[PDB]
């Protein structure tokens, strides 16, 4: 068949999003977890299975100990990562990598070894005709169809900021801020103990992630919302554990996302997401700031909370010159924008001459990633 198609896989920490190129929605979405059985089982006829990957680990959660292999954009163990890619190709997608060019996403300001080992595993573990590794923020810009903008991209991995102007890229104005949605998960379990709710193992650590992705929101002004929390009402919400324990959370609920705007709360000097965005724009050339301020793009998994766009607009408008109008484009579907950006990118015929081929790898070895791509 023409083009053969291609495979696109997004693997920032927390979630695998994967599927074919030129499909607009993916063909698998699941959590990037490898769950090994901590407790020895005493029965006959079980499994056994070394580990459970994806949602089998979500389902059988309490027996297990759960390991994310990707921490802060860095792959911390590579059998656990290989199993995640083995699982995507053979369980949900049901393809041979031999049929398909594979596009992988990768993070701003990441150790070279993550690109160089990632290309080796794709070329030597799952035999593949061609592949590419592509920067996450540029892919999310491609998804929102833009040529120009400043991309604030944040997963349960790390927070990255890339300014872009009529294509191109500015390497000196790329900022990395090691605050992720995952650090917010650890902050959330740490704050919950003030109300006596002690959660301590990885299994209920993902229950606070599940609380985080639908009860939490960003305060439209922090002190004002914290002051009205004296008279608890709409600010408190009931929540049901799969135990049947009821959990009621208050001011706690919005002061967890506040940590993105106040990193003093997690104990780090490193400036907030509004301030890091300003730091990137100040590193950029004087002219292009006008359009970068009016073309702020939000992507990733921890940009999903209510009130983030609204708040970032107040804080950037307050810090920036008010001679120009700050506009943030934070679309719905923004959790998947990096994948959508890869699915469009792999559907460009000019980009089909920009792949890293198997032959180029076999001739010139693993180091060639930083000699052909970003």
């Amino acid at each position: 068949e023409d083009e053969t198609t291609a495979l696109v896989c997004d693997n920032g920490s927390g979630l695998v999003k994967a599927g074919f190129a030129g499909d607009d929605a993916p063909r698998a979405v699941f959590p990037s977890i490898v769950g090994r059985p901590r407790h020895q089982g005493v029965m006959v006829g079980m499994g056994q299975k070394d580990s459970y990957v994806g949602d089998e680990a979500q389902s059988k959660r309490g027996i297990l100990t759960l390991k994310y292999p990707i921490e802060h954009g860095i792959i911390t163990n590579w059998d656990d990562m290989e199993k995640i890619w083995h699982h995507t190709f053979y369980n949900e997608l049901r393809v041979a990598p031999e049929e398909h060019p594979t596009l992988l996403t990768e993070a701003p300001l990441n150790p070279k070894a993550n690109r160089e080992k990632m290309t080796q595993i794709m070329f030597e573990t799952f035999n593949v005709p061609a592949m590419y590794v592509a920067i996450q923020a540029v892919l999310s810009l491609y998804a929102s169809g833009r040529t120009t903008g400043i991309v604030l991209d944040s997963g349960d991995g790390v927070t990255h900021n890339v300014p872009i102007y009529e294509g191109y890229a500015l390497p000196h104005a790329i900022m990395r801020l090691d605050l992720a949605g995952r650090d917010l998960t650890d902050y959330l379990m740490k704050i919950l103990t003030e109300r006596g709710y002690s959660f301590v193992t990885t299994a209920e650590r993902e229950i606070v992630r599940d609380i985080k992705e639908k009860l939490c929101y960003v305060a439209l002004d922090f002190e004002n919302e914290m002051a009205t929390a004296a008279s608890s009402s709409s600010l408190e919400k009931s929540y049901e554990l799969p135990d049947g324990q009821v959990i009621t959370i208050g001011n706690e609920r919005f002061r967890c996302p506040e940590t993105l705007f106040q990193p003093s709360f997690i104990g780090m000097e490193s400036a907030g997401i509004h301030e890091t965005t300003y730091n990137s724009i100040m590193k950029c050339d004087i002219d292009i700031r006008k359009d970068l301020y009016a073309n702020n793009v939000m992507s990733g998994g921890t940009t999903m909370y209510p009130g983030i766009a609204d708040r970032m607009q107040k804080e950037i408008t307050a810090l920036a010159p008010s001679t120009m109008k700050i506009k943030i484009i934070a679309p719905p579907e923004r959790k998947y924008s990096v994948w959508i950006g890869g699915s469009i990118l792999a559907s460009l015929s000019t980009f089909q001459q920009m792949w890293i081929t198997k032959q180029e790898y076999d001739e010139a070895g693993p180091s060639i990633v930083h000699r052909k791509c970003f």
Partner: protein, 610 residues
């Protein structure tokens, strides 16, 4: 001409053993079909309006007076039954197909925009078994997008003027050509045309073909529904990329005319769900993607109506007997040239280039067998390799349609970008692709191709969004569930794929969902037509029209030159000049030409004649 004596006189003879005629070419096809026991195809190039089908009725009349006797001793070889005439309903079949698939164009008021393949079917004993009609190529773009001074298909205009309140109230089409945004250029009232009566004759023709009044009204509901799509006006929202459709009425009017809940259609079109193995997640579409999805649904609905209509037409062509082999007759457009040459013009020229390549290959094999029959081994290039470079320029991953297919999926694509990328990629490496390069007034057109007919200069304007046909699987899967029988039956897939390897992507489905270009669908349908033609022995008729006037004794030389360029006759003369075209017997050469060389040609002992 065309009396019983003339058909009786031709029978079983070679084409140089009786004067030039179509009946002679059909005698070669009938005799080759009986002798070599293989299928044949008559290819007739589309000049006008030229009475091509009327001459094909004479071919059918020829086949009828030949094929009267086979296996069955006394099988009513005269009157067939009470009145076992020919398929006289082949006459009735034309205004139905002609309204649906012919339009008023700059070249003629009636020009065929589909590939009509008539299959006359025979048993092993040379008798008629039945006939089928197949349709292959269709300008399905012509429904949505037209040229600057042409009509869309006649059926829309004749529906608008003919239909009384009696049928108009049931379709809700009383709003004239200014309502419908897919009717470009407005009404296009021809000077002294009533239209109107033409569809009374057509509606009578449909009823004579045995279709019910209910079917006829249901068909005309869907020819309204294809138009009704262009009245849906999406509004690009402040800040949000997605857009939304505020005015329900047109969707409600479409829902009444079809089968859909408005709420589910509005969700499915604006924010469709895509199968994410095995879950279903929503997809944002831009205002441009939603308008392209509505255009694709219109173009695909008309395509499905036409494919159902030909299938339903075959269901009233009775089959009295099993069939062993067939004679194809291809009635399609010829190669066209206008001043303004756009995307559909490139598509027509591309099909004619492949059809002409099959002529060139057939001429190569016919010459090669004749070289061997006379004992002369001679080796020479294929004549289909003259056109191969033009075909591979248009076709293939680096060709014009592929670069257009890339560019329409590019995130900010322009008409200027398409031309520059094609210049950089392929023009400076391709002898048959020219960039003209003068200033305005000497080169309005944006690029030029050299084809068998000569240079054709193209205007690129709007080719990207003509090319787009992206089809939302959610909206198609709503139409599959239609409570109106006709629309559900039309939307019955037609892609076969879900039977092959079951419910996955295992190679049995093309680019379906997102993607889908008219150029890919045109290439796919053309490859199906070419495979079916390549599986038969072809014979060639080339029709010429001598004048616009409609009366003889005048033959317009410039029109005849343009037709000879476009129909490949000028190619066939340059082909036979590569070979040895003139072929004279040893006896004839001696008997006519002895007068030349008395010194060389001696005494009456010089017999043998070699």
């Amino acid at each position: 001409v065309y009396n019983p004596e003339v058909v009786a006189a031709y029978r079983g003879k070679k084409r140089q053993e009786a004067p030039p005629h179509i009946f002679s070419i059909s005698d070669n096809a009938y005799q080759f079909m009986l002798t070599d026991r293989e299928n044949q195809s008559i290819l007739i190039t589309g000049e006008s309006g030229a009475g091509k089908t009327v001459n094909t009725k004479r071919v059918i009349q020829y086949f009828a007076t030949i094929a009267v006797t086979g296996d069955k001793k006394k099988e009513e070889a005269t009157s067939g039954k009470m009145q076992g005439t020919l398929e006289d309903q082949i006459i009735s079949a034309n205004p139905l197909l002609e309204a649906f698939g012919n339009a008023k164009t700059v070249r003629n008021d009636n020009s065929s925009r589909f590939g009509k393949f008539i299959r006359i079917h025979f048993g092993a004993t040379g008798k008629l078994a039945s006939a089928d009609i197949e349709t292959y190529l269709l300008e399905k773009s012509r429904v949505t997008f037209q040229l600057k001074a042409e009509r869309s298909y006649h059926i829309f205009y004749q529906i608008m003027s003919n239909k009384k309140p009696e049928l108009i109230e049931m379709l809700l089409i009383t709003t004239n050509p200014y309502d419908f945004a897919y009717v470009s250029q407005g009404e296009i009232t021809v000077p002294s045309i009533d239209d109107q009566e033409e569809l009374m004759a057509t509606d009578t023709a449909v009823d004579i073909l045995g279709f019910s009044a209910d079917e006829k009204v249901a068909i005309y509901k869907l020819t309204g529904a294809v138009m009704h799509y262009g009245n849906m006006k999406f509004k690009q929202k402040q800040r949000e990329e997605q857009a939304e459709p505020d005015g329900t009425e047109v969707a409600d009017k479409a829902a009444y005319l079809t089968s859909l809940n408005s709420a589910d259609l509005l969700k499915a079109l604006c924010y469709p769900r895509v199968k994410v193995g095995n879950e279903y997640v929503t997809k944002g579409q831009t205002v441009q993607q939603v308008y392209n999805s509505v255009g694709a649904l219109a173009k695909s609905m008309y395509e499905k109506m036409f494919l159902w209509m030909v299938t339903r037409i075959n269901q009233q062509l009775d089959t009295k007997q099993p069939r062993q082999y067939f004679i194809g007759v291809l009635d399609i457009a010829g190669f066209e040239i206008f001043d303004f040459n756009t995307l559909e013009q490139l598509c027509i020229n591309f099909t004619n280039e492949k059809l002409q390549q099959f002529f060139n290959h057939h001429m190569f094999v016919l010459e090669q067998e004749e070289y061997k029959k006379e004992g002369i081994d001679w080796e020479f290039i294929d004549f289909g390799m003259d056109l191969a470079a033009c075909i591979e320029l248009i076709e293939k991953p680096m060709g014009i349609f592929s670069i257009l297919e890339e560019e329409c999926m590019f995130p900010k694509a322009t008409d200027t970008s398409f031309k520059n990328k094609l210049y950089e990629q392929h023009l400076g490496k391709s002898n048959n692709f020219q960039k003209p390069k003068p200033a305005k007034g000497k080169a309005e057109a944006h690029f030029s191709l050299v084809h068998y007919a000569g240079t054709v200069d193209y205007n690129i304007i709007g080719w990207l969004d003509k090319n787009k046909d992206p089809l939302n699987e959610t909206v198609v899967g709503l139409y599959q569930k239609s409570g109106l029988k006709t629309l559900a039956f039309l939307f019955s897939g037609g892609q076969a794929a879900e039977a092959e390897g079951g419910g996955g992507k295992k190679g049995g489905k093309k680019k379906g969902s997102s993607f889908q270009t008219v150029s890919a669908l045109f290439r796919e349908n053309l490859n199906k037509l070419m495979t079916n033609l390549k599986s038969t022995h072809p014979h060639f008729v080339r029709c010429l029209i001598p004048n616009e006037t409609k009366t003889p004794g005048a033959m317009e030389h410039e029109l005849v030159l343009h037709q000879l360029r476009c129909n490949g006759v000028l190619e066939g003369i340059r082909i036979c000049r590569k070979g040895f075209p003139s072929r004279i017997l040893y006896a004839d050469f001696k008997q006519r030409y002895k007068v030349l060389n008395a010194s060389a040609i001696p005494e009456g002992q010089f017999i043998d004649s070699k």
